[PDB]
Amino acid sequence: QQEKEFLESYPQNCPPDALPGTPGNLDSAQEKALAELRKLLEDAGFIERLDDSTLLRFLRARKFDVQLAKEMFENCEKWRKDYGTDTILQDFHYDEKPLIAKFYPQYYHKTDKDGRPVYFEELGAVNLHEMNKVTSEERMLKNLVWEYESVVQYRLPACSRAAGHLVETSCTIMDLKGISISSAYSVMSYVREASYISQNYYPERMGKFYIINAPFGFSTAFRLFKPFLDPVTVSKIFILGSSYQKELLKQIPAENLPVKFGGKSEVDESKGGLYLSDIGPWRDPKYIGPEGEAPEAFSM
Numbered sequence: 385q386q387e388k389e390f391l392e393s394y395p396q397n398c399p400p401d402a403l404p405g406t407p408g409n410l411d412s413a414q415e416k417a418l419a420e421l422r423k424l425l426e427d428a429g430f431i432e433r434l435d436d437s438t439l440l441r442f443l444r445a446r447k448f449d450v451q452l453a454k455e456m457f458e459n460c461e462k463w464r465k466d467y468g469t470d471t472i473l474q475d476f477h478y479d480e481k482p483l484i485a486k487f488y489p490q491y492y493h494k495t496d497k498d499g500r501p502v503y504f505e506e507l508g509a510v511n512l513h514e515m516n517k518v519t520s521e522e523r524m525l526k527n528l529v530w531e532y533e534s535v536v537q538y539r540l541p542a543c544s545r546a547a548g549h550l551v552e553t554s555c556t557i558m559d560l561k562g563i564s565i566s567s568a569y570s571v572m573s574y575v576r577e578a579s580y581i582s583q584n585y586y587p588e589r590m591g592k593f594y595i596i597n598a599p600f601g602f603s604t605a606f607r608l609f610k611p612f613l614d615p616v617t618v619s620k621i622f623i624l625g626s627s628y629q630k631e632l633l634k635q636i637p638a639e640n641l642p643v644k645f646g647g648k649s650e651v652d653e654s655k656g657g658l659y660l661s662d663i664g665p666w667r668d669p670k671y672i673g674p675e676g677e678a679p680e681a682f683s684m
């Protein structure tokens with residue numbers, strides 16, 4: 385089978401200091417639960433996506449409850465059927481991206497110190513009025529699941545090879561510079577849907593989340609209630625104000641961080657600039673495997 389060929393083409397163990405329940409770091413209890421859940425899925429008829437990394441993501445998502453995790457998996461499979469996710473990399477074509485990239489900037493640029501692909505989202509700059517001139521929110525969400533499928537199929541394997549260990553997760557940087565109460569309400573619908581797709585259909589894919597240029601009240605609230613979030617979440621999520629450069633550089637090598645966020649990585653304006661760039665390990669022949677090089681989101 386070619387799923388066998390694929391998972392053998394990149395490192396499959398997480399580093400030993402990763403949170404427990406991750407691949408390669410399983411205690412006796414968890415080990416039993418994993419094949420127990422697998423058996424049920426096999427019995428239920430599933431053939432696809434029954435690998436350790438996948439099943440453990442759902443397991444870690446339901447505190448290792450084998451039954452709730454089966455529900456989660458089944459629902460996701462149903463969604464993949466209805467939504468058409470298994471074929472989205474062929475069917476969907478976001479050809480309007482060049483026109484609307486400035487309106488809502490979203491790009492993947494290199495990796496962080498743990499080998500995770502970095503996702504940049506400049507939400508603060510969002511201008512939906514201009515965007516809705518050319519696209520719909522239905523189309524914005526397809527592009528989200530398209531990018532997501534790109535990460536799973538092409539970005540994460542390449543990142544795994546480039547780092548020497550399994551990379552299951554992305555590192556998200558969300559820039560609020562420019563956000564207002566007006567525009568906040570205007571993107572709530574999209575963010576809420578994206579959040580639902582993320583948690584329910586792509587569990588445990590979020591590894592680091594940085595919000596930068598947060599407004600004072602938002603920044604403050606997090607600071608005050610920090611002592612009451614569980615320590616696993618408090619190590620994944622960072623809400624930062626206007627001085628985030630040193631915080632980003634602890635997580636992303638300066639050579640991989642865009643100059644505009646305080647690093648050295650540059651992108652030629654000849655290729656459409658950073659808003660249209662997709663640079664990383666997934667574009668390097670040394671780290672591309674039997675999956676082949678990933679697609680590009682648009683024609684040009």
Ligand SMILES: O=C(NCc1ccc2c(c1)OCO2)c1ncc(Br)cc1F
Nearest residue numbers: 532535554556575578579582586589590
């Ligand atoms: O969880 C993820 N990203 C974190 C995140 C960060 C901001 C968001 C969001 C999700 O959904 C809405 O806004 C996430 N990352 C990569 C892949 Br593939 C799937 C995902 F669900």
